[PDB]
Amino acid sequence: MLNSNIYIIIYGGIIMYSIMIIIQMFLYNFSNKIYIEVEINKYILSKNNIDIYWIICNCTIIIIITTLNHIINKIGIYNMIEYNICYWLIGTGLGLYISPFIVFGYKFFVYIMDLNNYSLNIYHNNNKMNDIQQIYNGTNYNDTMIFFIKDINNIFTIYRSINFFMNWLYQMIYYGVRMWLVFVLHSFSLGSFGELITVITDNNLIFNVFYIGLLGLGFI
Amino acid sequence: PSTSPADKDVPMSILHTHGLSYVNWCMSLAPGLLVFEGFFRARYYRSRVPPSRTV
Amino acid sequence: RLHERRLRGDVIDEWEELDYHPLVRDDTYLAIDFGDPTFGRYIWKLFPHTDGD
Amino acid sequence: AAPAEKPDPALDATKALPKALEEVEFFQSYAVRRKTGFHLFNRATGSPTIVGPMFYNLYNFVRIGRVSKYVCWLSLPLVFQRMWMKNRATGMEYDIDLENYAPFEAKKNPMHGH
Amino acid sequence: LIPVSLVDLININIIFYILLLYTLLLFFIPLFLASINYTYHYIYKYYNYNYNFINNN
Amino acid sequence: FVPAWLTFTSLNHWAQNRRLNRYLTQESVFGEMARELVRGKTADEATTSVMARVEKEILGVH
Amino acid sequence: DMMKVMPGGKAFVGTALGLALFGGWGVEFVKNISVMTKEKPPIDWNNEKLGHLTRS
Amino acid sequence: SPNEHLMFFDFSSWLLVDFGKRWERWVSFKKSFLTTTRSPYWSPQ
Amino acid sequence: VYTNWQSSYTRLFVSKPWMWHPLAWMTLSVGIWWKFGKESLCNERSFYIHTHPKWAPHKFHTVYNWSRDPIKWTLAEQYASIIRNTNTDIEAVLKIKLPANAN
Amino acid sequence: EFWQMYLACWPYRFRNTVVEWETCKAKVLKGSVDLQDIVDLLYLLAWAYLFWILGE
Amino acid sequence: PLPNAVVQGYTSVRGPKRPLDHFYGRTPLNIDTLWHWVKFPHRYDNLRFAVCFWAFLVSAHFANKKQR
Amino acid sequence: APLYPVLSQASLYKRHFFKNIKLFHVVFYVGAPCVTFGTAAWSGSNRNSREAIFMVIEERHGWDNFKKLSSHQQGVIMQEAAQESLLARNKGELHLP
Amino acid sequence: VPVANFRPKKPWDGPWGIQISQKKDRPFIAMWILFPLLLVDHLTREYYAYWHSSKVPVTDVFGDF
Ligand SMILES: CCCCCCCCCCCCCCCC(=O)OC[C@H](COP(=O)(O)O)OC(=O)CCCCCCCCCCCCCCC
Ligand SMILES: CCCCCCCCCCCCO[C@@H]1O[C@H](CO)[C@@H](O[C@H]2O[C@H](CO)[C@@H](O)[C@H](O)[C@H]2O)[C@H](O)[C@H]1O
Ligand SMILES: CCCCCCCCCCCCO[C@@H]1O[C@H](CO)[C@@H](O[C@H]2O[C@H](CO)[C@@H](O)[C@H](O)[C@H]2O)[C@H](O)[C@H]1O
Ligand SMILES: CCCCCCCCCCCCO[C@@H]1O[C@H](CO)[C@@H](O[C@H]2O[C@H](CO)[C@@H](O)[C@H](O)[C@H]2O)[C@H](O)[C@H]1O
Ligand SMILES: COCCOCCOCCOc1ccc(C(C)(C)CC(C)(C)C)cc1
Ligand SMILES: COCCOCCOCCOc1ccc(C(C)(C)CC(C)(C)C)cc1
Ligand SMILES: COCCOCCOCCOc1ccc(C(C)(C)CC(C)(C)C)cc1
Ligand SMILES: COCCOCCOCCOc1ccc(C(C)(C)CC(C)(C)C)cc1
């Protein structure tokens, strides 16, 4: 039929693996709480501290939990989840990205919409003509015949308001990609060296022996 | 509608497994659990000392 | 009255014991509602003889 | 702007390395062993090995486990399974026709895609 | 390599993982907040109003 | 807000009414579909009834 | 321009109004910079013959 | 293989969703809700 | 003593932005999939990219078997079920002759 | 020493087969079956299933 | 590497921890205190030998009959 | 005269078994069966050898014909395929891409 | 005359403390039931596609097919 628009999703093991990540949070009980307390009180002082703190704590502990589940509890998704880029961008990076905009979104929004009224910032602005320029003309700068290109100006000014919120996104993406590359490449390199060693020893059974030890190599 | 084909139903036997290497088994991190279970159990249950008499 | 039970060897839950401290039970429940599990500087400001302790 | 905060000792770093060394010392305390029944094959020079004298500690901790010391060995027969199957496969006789018609993971097979 | 894939960039399965995870988080927040601090015990025990009386004589 | 809300909603409602009235008097495929729906027919039945005409008159069925 | 800097959300109003009116055309203009130089085919102007159908 | 360890083959099935049919039924539910409630045009519903 | 912790989840959610954070996260992830991943991957017209070895390596645990084509026969069974539920004529599509937008 | 005790233990095992069987029958009929008995019977059934496969 | 607050577990003040309950007059019940109730199987070992023999034999009998 | 639903001693004794867990008591006790019977050691080896086995079979013999044979000859061909794949004569005896 | 700042409990005073404890230890109880269920979900699982598979398991969510 014509009206039938069909979509195919690929579904796997999600429910029981996501339940235990949360059930473990009662065991960990936010052991990272003191570190993030210290850092948040280093970096900001406001009434809305606890909010951002809680966010980071949740995010961080989940990461930690997954990492340990990726190291120890090896089943299904827990192995891939740190080797996947979607987890590192959307499962760790997006929450940390939107956390300050969810805690201090009022102030940031007001700031951003005020910066669209672009103007030169003067320290100790005891000037009088500055006020008349800012009110009558809208800006300190000369805005004569900029309406002629307003179609671009608006959108450009929008970027001009968020340009100083953009490196946060860049750093989030960069460090997510960094963690993904680190995990993937190191796992692959280690496994590759192991496989080469097994090829050397399988063809020479004088060496196909627990030559370092059953627990020594594993412990190391 | 929903389906459950017979292609997924195949024979199974542990005899046909290739297996693992000594290196891959060491990378499975079982030898680490083997030690650190006892390590953490010892730390927890040895932190709490009982009363005693010095002889 | 609760300590009478504790002396008999009875185990009292952490929250069952708090109900026998009702004025602290209320302020503790509100601190939970606010969601700030931190502590220590409030004691050091209200009781400055504990500062640094 | 000019708050004049005194130094907080909790923000210092004078306990992490001591605590880690305390943990490592607790680990190494379980390496203490009696002279009776002691044997360790040294190197040909006569000098000790690295992993050798740090097996007693690991197995003294395995002694204290409850579940791993009876489970984590059940993946070890699989190692010998591979050791045996690899040698079986090193010299297995196969049909030339099937190997030329259906080579396993060979390149440039259009039925695979490349 | 397998994890190098655009299919795994916007994988709906991991999005379901995140969804279920944080819905369960939200469900269990009121149990994470259920830790007791002993600060109001201290305030009750140690806050002592001045109990001295006034005596003009 | 109440006068503004009523103005907005009523103007858009009357705009949609005008749109339907204009479609019904339109000698086209969409006019026929709108007419068939205003009778009180189901969407699927009206789609089939109009496509039976589209295949014959418009597309020139084999 | 003088309403933009007023208080009471008028900065948001001015920005959103400029967007809704002209910033959409600006987005289209930016999209069209890499289209002016490109070889495009003739526009298949509608013959305005398909769609007419007598009522019944 | 190492790449075999970097793979997630814990899939269970393919969920097939006719978004056209689902959209049609959603619109039908909206119409039924607005008719049963006898809601006017100025309503937020 | 009244607390939204024990008596109202709604007022607790409203009073804590760190409870809004996961919900916004969820909404944003689903919007990302809707805008970018939905039509490019999950639609039937865009589902064969999972057979690509470069952009979807070993999505079937192996290289895709094109002689077998599981996608084709799965989806064909499903389309056949649709056709039987709708009672559409298979050969009715072949009787169509579309015109051209002349001139 | 182990060989001597392995030999000497065979009469004990063959004698206590019947004893353990009778006690199990009595506990199952009487219903006086406890946790340790259940665990021992599960271990028994596991080994029996293994030896069933082996006999197959 | 890490501040002293994270190591000692508190930023300013060390909070008291509620001690563990004991339940006087009975054994502790924990994940590690279960061997008091469940020892290794020791009651039906000789019956295990007998049943293993009979299981092997009966399985071999019916399997051989089926195969033949 | 407690006005609340006083909980018996035995009920607390039983709940203490559930809430007196430590982190390692979960981590290691659940990681040992998991690491042994998981995607690393046993389940992974089994389920990933099966893929190569049936690839080899369907390429060389066919899945339908394989289904028609006996369980014994099925296992024989499966073992031959497992050996062919473990060897990896075409990859230079290396399980890498 | 009674003592001040004291009253009987009310419905909006919430549950007692023992009830909050009973609420807290429910995850800890379900842990023992869910971790074995996790291991069973992984161990009793079968892959969904092979090189020979002409079909793949499909799950019509809303029965539209
Ligand atoms: C030639 C064959 C290999 C060599 C000879 C046979 C192996 C001999 C070694 C001993 C037997 C090994 C068994 C191998 C089975 C296998 O393949 O293991 C893999 C299989 C799954 O493989 P498939 O999914 O492919 O069928 O899983 C199982 O067998 C299920 C075992 C259940 C284990 C539960 C252990 C619980 C321990 C208590 C912990 C309590 C803590 C809480 C957690 C709930
Ligand atoms: C070395 C190179 C540079 C990198 C340095 C950073 C490495 C960080 C990784 C090691 C992390 C160890 O993390 C360790 O977690 C435990 C949780 O049990 C914390 O433990 C802390 O919290 C617990 C409760 O949660 C308190 O009861 C305890 O008193 C306190 O020590 C440790 O303070 C921290 O040190
Ligand atoms: C301070 C040290 C500085 C030097 C750094 C050296 C790099 C160390 C990298 C550690 C990270 C490697 O990460 C680790 O990779 C190995 C190898 O694949 C994975 O190991 C897993 O896959 C391999 C691949 O064959 C299997 O054989 C193995 O049985 C399984 O456990 C581990 O699950 C993962 O945790
Ligand atoms: C649990 C995770 C998933 C949660 C998903 C919830 C998403 C909710 C947002 C729904 C968005 C509504 O967005 C709406 O989508 C439908 C398809 O469904 C589009 O509909 C479009 O495509 C459909 C079929 O594909 C056509 O039949 C229809 O005529 C056309 O308009 C609408 O134009 C759009 O407005
Ligand atoms: C070079 O690396 C130096 C980094 O130092 C890391 C320091 O962190 C040490 C963390 O290890 C622990 C773990 C537990 C504990 C205690 C004993 C306090 C745990 C507790 C609260 C259960 C008793 C102390 C230290
Ligand atoms: C959580 O942090 C704990 C991690 O600590 C791990 C430490 O691992 C190193 C232990 O390995 C050794 C090394 C040396 C030794 C002994 C060989 C100290 C030297 C000896 C016995 C000859 C004096 C024993 C064990
Ligand atoms: C006295 O009774 C003791 C337990 O007896 C239980 C009998 O259970 C019947 C099991 O049936 C089978 C038969 C064969 C198999 C196969 C061939 C699949 C097992 C295999 C692959 C390990 C050889 C599995 C189960
Ligand atoms: C170099 O370091 C290697 C050691 O790392 C081993 C990783 O172990 C994983 C988690 O192990 C635990 C387990 C329990 C704990 C404690 C005992 C502190 C848990 C607690 C806080 C509940 C008592 C800490 C770490």
Residue numbers in the entry:
A (entry chain f): 1 to 220
B (entry chain g): 2 to 56
C (entry chain h): 372 to 424
D (entry chain p): 7 to 120
E (entry chain l): 1 to 57
F (entry chain d): 126 to 187
G (entry chain k), J (entry chain M): 58 to 113
H (entry chain o): 14 to 58
Passage from the reporting paper:
The membrane region was determined to 2.8 Å resolution, enabling the identification of a structurally divergent subunit a and visualisation of 37 associated native lipids. The membrane-bound Fo region is composed of 22 proteins, of which 13 have no homologs in animals and fungi. The well-resolved membrane region allowed the identification of 37 native lipids, leading to the assignment of 25 cardiolipins, whereas the 12 remaining phophoslipids could not be unambiguously identified and were modelled as phosphatidic acid. Importantly, cardiolipin binding sites are found at the rotor-stator interface, dimer interface, and in a peripheral Fo cavity. Our cryo-EM map allowed tracing of subunit a, for which we identified six structurally conserved membrane-embedded helices (H1a to H6a) directly from side-chain densities. By contrast, in the E. gracilis structure, the N-terminal part of H5a is kinked towards the lumen, and therefore does not interact with the c-ring, and instead extends towards the lumenal membrane surface. This structural rearrangement results in a smaller interface between subunits a and c, with only three c-subunits forming interactions, which also has implications for the formation of the matrix half-channel. At the exit of the lumenal half-channel, we identified a β-DDM detergent molecule, with its hydrophilic maltose head group protruding into the channel and the acyl chain extending between H5a and H6a, confirming both the hydrophilic environment and accessibility of the membrane-intrinsic lumen channel. Adjacent to the proton-half channels, the E. gracilis ATP synthase structure reveals two bound cardiolipins (CDL1, CDL2) flanking either side of the two horizontal helices H5a and H6a. Near the matrix half-channel, CDL2 is coordinated collectively by R160 of H5a, R50 of ATPEG6 and R22 of subunit k. Together, these two bound cardiolipins enclose the two horizontal membrane helices H5a and H6a, possibly acting to seal the Fo against proton leakage by recruiting a high density of acyl chains, as well as separating lipid and aqueous environments in the vicinity of the two half-channels.
